[model samples]
Target: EEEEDAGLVAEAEAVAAGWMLDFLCLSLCRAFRDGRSEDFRRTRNSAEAIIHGLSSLTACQLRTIYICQFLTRIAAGKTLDAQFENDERITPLESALMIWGSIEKEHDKLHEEIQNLIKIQAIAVCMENGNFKEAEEVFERIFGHMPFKSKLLMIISQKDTFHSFFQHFSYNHMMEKIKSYVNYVLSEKSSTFLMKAAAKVVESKR
Candidate 1:
């Protein structure tokens, strides 16, 4: 991106810049997968390209679309690179989180279902980066508000996040987290009678 060919990214129309955005993602993806010392450098350049202009495209298109998986890969690439070099001065996970937050806020003001899924990726990303307390705070707070079924389905759907957490957290800690989730379902803000009864049954196994 800094290699500047006229720096005309704002001129990027959705149709072609769409291609431009994804084209760079592939390069970004390839750069990381193939693992060069320069792999992350390529990711940074291409990512910075999309970082600024994705919103530009959103502005042009009157939509708040973000290719989260692409962004996740970029964040993973940059963050992993930072870890590799022990570079704490540059925080890519939190930086990418701001990007996630900015886009989600625009739509979360209205489109909740999409917002929820966007949040799932962010939650998983935080956990993936070894930020367990941060992930748990959001997980605990958000799940406490929704229906037990909805909460369970959302959590189960994103089993990879739980799986990732289990790798880093103790089995007992994971079970306690599971119990925390269940406590909310059985006794807190929302849970149907059937759901609550079902949740009670979960106690037997514990």
Candidate 2:
């Protein structure tokens, strides 16, 4: 993005500028996925500036929109603290679920969802602290308002299996489990009722 912004193209044609926007969007996605918040913000500002003219875009066309919004919310929330000027609140698992809900609403929101899921796993510097309020707030904000037939609540209710799956494993393991579960549901071999119930448990526990 910096390279593109620094005038990589000899001609400043509009078509070429569009491609630069695309490149910046891709870079923002990568930065978000890698949990590089600073890079994500810089790239997001650039992309938003370039595409600010478009207003009627469907949810899908907005590249990494959810992630940018999510990070903004997080950054805003963090500012309530007095010590750190740019430091944000701790990222929670509920944030992941919220991003998932966003993706389910608009499939093109996948990149944002992936980035959020990575953040959920990345911020556990302490083994002792827990923020149940933040987790619950995330669930309510993300899944509570959605029109799904209580799928989110159901998953929280059956949390032991979900927790068991999440416990003592690499992020890759969790992602694989998620993919497998989704594949199972799509295959029509079984319902995701069990997973839903587990999510309900998380909801209740939080």
Candidate 3:
């Protein structure tokens, strides 16, 4: 039994360290995009395991983003617990932006990928927990900081196509149902800032 457990851990570590790392990252991102917070939470350990397994590759930019994303999730998930008494470790948007900022300056190409990861994770977690307000707040924060309005509109409009494109995506139907509400809020100013923010979130094809 001990040996079996060790084998499982080893398998997890390998998954965490190899190409599986990217898969988990993309998976978590999609899960978040689809409003599958429960799925996101359940996949947390797998992500962390991959991070830990790949700690030796700390210098890799993609791995760094993954680490940040993993930690960010840990922080964000804490926000939902009624008993969550403190925010000591929660990854705020400001900090995430700073991380992205640094990465963007260093590697222009990676900038979009990192930003997309954060967007997907934030939206997924917020939607899953019914924290519509926070989700909206997150979207606004991103838009205010990045201001990619045209791109955002395009992504929201194509949510259905994107969902169907990914086999692992779980956000399809929920996003489809709320697409109009999301679009309307994004376009109108009287729409609470939160809704506008939520509406501005960027969705990518990954």
Candidate 4:
């Protein structure tokens, strides 16, 4: 009976994942086609409805839905335009972090990656609001280790918004740090290919 019940749970989770994906895709398509405030309004409503309906979600399903929610928030101008206050309700980015933490034991690597990505986004938002200190702290914490071919660095370099944030906070400082890290790693002959590839990507950005 226990094994049968577990099988039922797994089957239900799979069904829920499919349902959530279909709803997200269809709602986003409508928003894209309409391209108006009304479209955004509908999308937001749909997302909240779907979120409320979910009793539980598998980690992969949760991550996929979180991505959709993030995009929806961006479209609604909630992420960039809203004046956030300490008392305000939970933001989509914060919700992502919470979700990651809930599954961290089973998905530690993915949680770490998502946490860094969230920090990167937070840095951009902080800079946009002239909140340099917060941005700097997050930036240093994320890139302090400065590994070669770092996914975080590649993301920041390639993303226009993040690149702009880097410029705002002194692009030269970041480049110098990267260069110094590259030299240090190369001297130790640590993952030379990754280090070189990271250098190429960073140079291309410059």
Candidate 5:
């Protein structure tokens, strides 16, 4: 009888573990899908759910959870700033390092990918604080790789001074900078569409 009871308990534990793993996987899939769709509310909710579910996981699992959390936040248009410092679990840099170590032998490539994400997040933070030059420098490095529509959406949403910045005393300089950036990073078709949109904005204001 005792042997049977023990067997039942072991089976129950196995079932529970399997269920937990399934929930984690499903939740992550939902989060990533919402992120790609640019559904900010859904992405944020899914990330919070993942963080809650991560409480009982292993250290390696926790590292992966952090990476997903960062991705979801970025997708939701949240910037990584000093406010994140309140959470003392690990710095973004440390989290990236942990992820780099845990991934199998291709450490260098994974490290570079993590670095790019970090740089993008840093640029968002800079933009949030109106550090235009600093943001521009980081932007120059990664603009070609950035998602054109998503990055443009973020700039329009977060940067209240975006259009006005170009209209300042340095209007010509700013215009030239923007023209150069879009020409290089965007396809010819996209660049032409953007130019037309800018013309409409200028015409409306006049």
Candidate 6:
């Protein structure tokens, strides 16, 4: 099976492996929400098995990102509940970012949104430990990367976890950040879309 049509066979194996990882991720999510330690541990161990089965070289970036996503939750949960039986010296978010590190090339970027979300949580997990400087650092890092105004407004429109933090601190702070680096929008070329978004964002604040 490893001889004729080796390239196609390799791709097929990667696809199937990716599917297995995705299914494991689903079960991991279920285990996480169901709030039992054993269930998540079993699925995570199972996930670890299949992840090593496929090299990241063959797997698509989607699979890699989703794996990182699952790892983020695992890391976060570990912080919330420390097992301590086997002292994993590396921190939880460390586990999250390290896997991401394996795949992050010098420039092979994922979708902007997904890429930033990974970074967002990476920094978020750090900032939640009460690093106000890290708060602004994460703030700048995340908002700087965000290419659109609409998504910021979208976060405002929908009740989001981050929204509460913005609400307590700065409504003006929110709009200020949005307007500064909205150059990603080249469509309007004037100012209409941004202006409206700004007005709505301002009005929504009060």
Candidate 2 residues lying further than 4 Å off, grouped into runs, are 1-17, 33-37, 56-60, 67-96, 104-206
Of candidates 6 and 1, the better by TM-score: 6
Candidate 4 lDDT by residue in tens digits, 1-206: 89999989978876764565545544553443344557657666676676676567667556545544544543432254453235344443444444445542444454454454554554565555565554455455444634522644454444444354445434233323323422432244333333456679999998
TM-scores for every predicted model: 0.30, 0.36, 0.36, 0.37, 0.38, 0.35
Segments in model 4 whose C-alpha atoms lie over 4 Å from true places: 1-21, 29-38, 54-63, 73-121, 144-206
- What are the clashing pairs of model 4? none
Query: lDDT tens string, model 2, 1-206?
Result: 77776664433455545555545645654564465778877877887787774434345335345544554444332232222223244344334445545654434454454444443333221111343444444445444324322543443444333443235543564454444433432344232343446679999998
- Candidate 3 per-residue lDDT over residues 69-148, each given as its tens digit: 63343345335442222553233533454454554243444445445545554444555555555555656666553444
Question: What TM-score does model 6 achieve against the real structure?
Answer: 0.35
Q: lDDT per model, in order?
A: 0.44, 0.46, 0.48, 0.49, 0.45, 0.48
Superior candidate under lDDT, 2 versus 3: 3
- lDDT string for model 6 (73-192, tens) is 443632624432254443444344444455543323333333344444434444445444543444443455344334443443343545454344342332232222122212322323
Model 5 lDDT per residue over 143-192, tens place = 53445435544564566443433233232332233233223322322223
Best by lDDT, which number? 4
Question: Compared with the true structure, what per-residue lDDT tens digits does model 1 show for residues 1-206?
Answer: 66464355444354455655544544443443444437656656775675575544444222212333324433363243443224443234333434544553334332343234434443555556666555555455445425533543454455445564334433333223323322432343232333345568999789
Badly placed stretches (over 4 Å) of model 5 are 1-14, 33-67, 76-105, 108-111, 131-206
Clashing pairs in 1: none
Q: What local lDDT score does residue 16 receive in model 4, on the 0 to 100 scale?
A: 63
